[PDB]
Amino acid sequence: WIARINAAARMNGLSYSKLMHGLKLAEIDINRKMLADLAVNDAAAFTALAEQAKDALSK
Amino acid sequence: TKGILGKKVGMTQIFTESGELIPVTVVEATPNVVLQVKTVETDGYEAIQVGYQDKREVLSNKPAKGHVAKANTAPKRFIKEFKNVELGEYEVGKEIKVDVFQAGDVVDVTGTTKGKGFQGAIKRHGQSRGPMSHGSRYHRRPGSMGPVAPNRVFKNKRLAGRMGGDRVTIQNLEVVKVDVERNVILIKGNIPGAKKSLITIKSAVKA
Amino acid sequence: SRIGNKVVVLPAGVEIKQDGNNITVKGPKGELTREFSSDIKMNIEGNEVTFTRPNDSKEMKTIHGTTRANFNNMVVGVSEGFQKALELIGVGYRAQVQGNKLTLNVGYSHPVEMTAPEGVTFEVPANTQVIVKGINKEVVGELAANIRGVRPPEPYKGKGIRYVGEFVRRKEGKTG
Amino acid sequence: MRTTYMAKAGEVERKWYVVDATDVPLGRLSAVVASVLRGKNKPTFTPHVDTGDFVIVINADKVKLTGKKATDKIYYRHSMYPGGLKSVTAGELRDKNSRRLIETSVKGMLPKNTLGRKQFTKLNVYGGAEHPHAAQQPEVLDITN
Amino acid sequence: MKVRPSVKPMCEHCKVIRRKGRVMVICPANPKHKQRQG
RNA sequence: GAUAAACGCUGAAAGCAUCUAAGUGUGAAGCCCACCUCAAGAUGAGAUUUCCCAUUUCUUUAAGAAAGUAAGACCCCUGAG
RNA sequence: GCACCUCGAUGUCGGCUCGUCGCAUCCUGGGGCUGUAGUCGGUCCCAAGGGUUGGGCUGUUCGCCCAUUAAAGCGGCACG
RNA sequence: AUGUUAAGUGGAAAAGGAUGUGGGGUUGCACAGACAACUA
Ligand SMILES: [Zn+2]
Questions:
Q1: Domain ranges, residue C58
Q2: How many C-beta neighbours within 10 Å does residue D119 have?
Q3: Which of B16, C94, D28, D99 is least enclosed by beta carbons within 10 angstroms?
Q4: Residues of D in contact with B154 (CB under 8 A)
Q5: Separation of B90 CA from ligand 1 center, angstroms?
Q6: In a shared domain, residues C54 and C102
Q7: Run of H or E including B123
Q8: Other chains touching D, judged by 3 or more CB pairs under 8 Å
């Protein structure tokens, strides 16, 4: 799961560690299992989430 | 450069002008024919394909006749390639005869050595025997196979096996005489191979 | 640099073309070119040049000194040219000149032959003197150290080929 | 034993790429090429399947070596005959036979089993600016790493 | 040439240099003094 | 051909001197070729010349099965270089 | 020196046959210094491609001797 | 973010040797002219 998430996030301008920090600073609690499942099936949902993380650590 | 294919007839003797006796080897070479010309644009290098020794026609097949047809000859028994010869100067159909060489003409000579079969380390490699008396049980054997530490035998440990039958060339021999109406060259010394076996003669590489 | 700061002022005939790196001094004999570096730059107001240095480099001065020395040499030579003179001690030795063929006779069981490239010449007046003449400072020096290399000088009688000012030390070989 | 995707043999498309090797140090270029051949940049990555892309490396003659590697880094080989080490090579490979160079660097950064050996047959390396593979329509990759 | 791990100027005219990573002494008055550290 | 010890040429840092940092050479029975032999199972399996060119039912039409053949090869017999 | 290892078994030295590797180089190749005139040498540096002998006496290595040679190297490999 | 190392040091070893480079100090001699180089 972690390697698939890294692969997907680097396509949205992030890396794995910065995106995990961003999701924690926003209070999102998705598994790494559902995150990878989204990364392969629903790219638009994965981008919604990556934008929320990018705005969280923009402070 | 210069080079021809022939067959081995045998050895004889001859006296010179001054009156010295000299051992010799007769080689017979009826005219060789150029069958193909290889170039860089087509093949990637430069060479010449030569044939020797006409063959009866029940003994060849249709692909061979097609290959020999563009040169207007009978099917051949021996086909070799001759390299490092300024192409030009050559074309399919030409005949190379023994007057390509003249007396003098230090030359190289190649053949395939006689066959001898399964032979031991003493005849095959020049290894020495063990003692024949004095309580000995070690006459005609190949030696110790190595030391203990590597737990195996190294490569090029030499042993028994099939001897002879390899190709060998001998360098810097002399042409003693050339006879044109008979297609014969006389070479000073001995050559490798048996009688009726294929022989190749080229001008020498070390000049 | 004290060398890097000094002045090069070009006598008559000099033209100095610029193209990126290359410089090409020309004069009344030759038209030498040499590749120089970026971090030291050209100059204006003909019949004078200085070079300059953006500081803060570690060594702070080396590249500067060489980049000026070489240009001063090119000018000094393209207007004037350089000279190297070789002597000959060692009784029985002689040189002779035939175009670009320098023939030498030094104790050997064969004469020795040297040939000079484009920019260079030879000048043998006598069986003792040789003179190497060119524009380059490097090539003339290399060719003279080539010639003197055929037979350096011994110390017990000082025979052999020497630069025309070499100070050789002399030993006392006993008489047996 | 539940739902995580796993890819199949001929299901995930493989694209062709062109990478340019003038002034990139040997190992940095080689690390990036090695990750692209294994498919690590695609979320469909599964380890018992091959999903990497193909890579063309161009201008291998101008690859960079820092320090004194061009004279002091040496490649050894043994012929398995007694006393038969061959230490013949140095940064002479970069002059003559610069494909050997790139290939032996990339080969040591891939797994050592039958999948990693089959992923090595997608590298095509060229000493000059031109490749013979224009019918596969390859896209340019740009390195900054 | 002397090759020793102690390389020392031993008259007036001796100089020390570094032609590679290698210390050397070089004297124009006495060729016995020439030295290279090793 | 590129090098080891050694020896330079030009040259500054360090107005001089200095084989070295930038540039430029010489130099060993050693190293890579040069000579001889093996080598495409080099699964990265390479190249050139020549020779040969279509019946039957269908699972379904598919890199389908089965049958008789071309060029060529082999079994079997006389042997030896 | 020690006693980890092997006591339901790990057979000692010289010679023979067959070698291979290190370099702290015995010869041959290239060099700097000399209290190096030449012919021979001393010593230090680079160099492992190839070469490195037959007898007498002792079970003998080791050793001494005889006649030669460009030279008659020193170690590891279960003191192969 | 700010520096150091050029030795593949990092990624085995000492007495001793050295104009390798970074930082901090103590001073002799310097425009009533220094060190070096060239005349006499
Ligand atoms: Zn001195």
A1: 3-79
A2: 19
A3: B16
A4: 81-82
A5: 74
A6: no
A7: helix B121-125
A8: A, B
Q: Is C175 helix (H, G, I), strand (E, B) or coil?
A: coil
Check: CB of residue A6 under 8 Å from CB of residue A15: yes
For residue C62, report the phi and psi dihedrals to the nearest 5 degrees.
Answer: -65, -55
CA at C163, C1' at G34: how many angstroms apart? 26
Check if D43 contacts A (Cβ < 8 Å): yes
The three-class DSSP label of residue D28 is helix
For residue B69, how many other CB atoms are within 10 A of its CB?
A: 10
Nearest-5° Cα angle at B45, B40 to B50: 110
Task: Quote the number of domains for chain C.
Answer: 2
> What is the distance between the alpha carbons of residues C105 and C113, in angstroms, rounded to a whole number?
10
Phi and psi at E25, nearest 5°, equal -115, 145
Of D4, D41, D42, the CB nearest to A36: D4
The experimental method, as deposited, was cryo-EM
Give the integer Cα–Cα distance in Å for B45 and B49.
13
End-to-end CA distance of chain A: 28
Whether the CB of E19 is less than 7 Å away from nucleic strand H comes out as no
CA distance C166 to C146: 15
Stated in angstroms to one decimal place, the resolution of this structure is 2.9
| Within a domain: C175 | no
CB burial of residue C139 (10 Å; 0-12, 13-18, 19+): middle
Taking CA–CA distances from A43, the nearest residue in chain D reads: D43
Q: Checking DSSP bridges between strand D16-20 and strand D139-140, what pairing results, if any?
A: parallel
- Chain B interface residues facing chain D, Cβ-Cβ under 8 Å? 154-156
| Nucleotides of G strand lying within 7 Å of any protein CB atom | 16-22, 31-38, 44-46, 49, 77-78, 80
Is residue C47 domain-shared with residue C96, that is, in the same domain?
no
Segments forming the whole domain that contains residue D117: 1-145
Closest-CA distance of chain B to residue D138, Å: 30
DSSP H or E stretch at residue B69: helix B62-69
Looking at the structure, do residues C100 and C34 belong to the same domain, yes or no?
Answer: no
Tell me if E15 is assigned to a ligand binding site: no
Number of domains in chain D: 1
| Same domain flag for C74 and C130 | no
D74: left (phi over 0), alpha (psi -120 to 50) or beta: beta
Residues of A with CB under 8 A from a CB of D: 1, 3-5, 7-8, 10, 33, 36-37, 39-41
CB pair distance less than 8 Å for D5 and A33: no
> Is there a single domain that holds both residue C86 and residue C75?
no
- Output DSSP code: residue C50: -
Give the span between the Cα atoms of A26 and C169, in whole angstroms.
Answer: 89
